[PDB]
Amino acid sequence: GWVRPDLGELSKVTKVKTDRPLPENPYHSRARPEPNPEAEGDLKPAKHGSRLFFWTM
Amino acid sequence: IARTFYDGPEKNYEKTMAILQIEAEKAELRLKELEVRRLMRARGDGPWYQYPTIDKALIDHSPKTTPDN
Ligand SMILES: CCCCCCCCCCCCCCCCC[C@@H](O)O[C@H](CO[C@H](O)CCCCCCCCCCCCCCC)COP(=O)(O)OCC[N+](C)(C)C
Question: Distance, in angstroms, between B15 CA and closest chain A CA?
Fold first, then answer.
């Protein structure tokens, strides 16, 4: 009582119901380093301008 | 002559006091900026001297046609 699969059936993406737990870290990755914190606060004008040699702004 | 052409000495006194304060703050800021630049170029954890890396959004997290990878 076997029915041969039709065209386009054996190439289907099928669901699988299993009991094996999903691996937490299959790549065995390390701990990612902490990034640079942030840019915080509002922008205030530069103190005493450019402060480049004799220029006052 | 003093009444018509010149002013009191307190005016020049306070003016040069303000000028001295401004220049002292500028000198301190310049030294602090040099130190900050040195430290952040040595360590690289600051906003400046950040060199680009490879974006992680380019990686493809899909089946790769082989089980291992
Ligand atoms: C009394 C008689 C016997 C004694 C004579 C004494 C001779 C003294 C006269 C000679 C003057 C010397 C020239 C020095 C000019 C100084 C310029 C400057 O310093 O003055 C400014 C202002 O200038 C003055 O108003 C004088 C300007 C007049 C320029 C003199 C030129 C006169 C020469 C004559 C030329 C004749 C031309 C003929 C055409 C045919 C001041 O700036 P200001 O920040 O505002 O004021 C600060 C003081 N406050 C705040 C208290 C007011």
Answer: 16
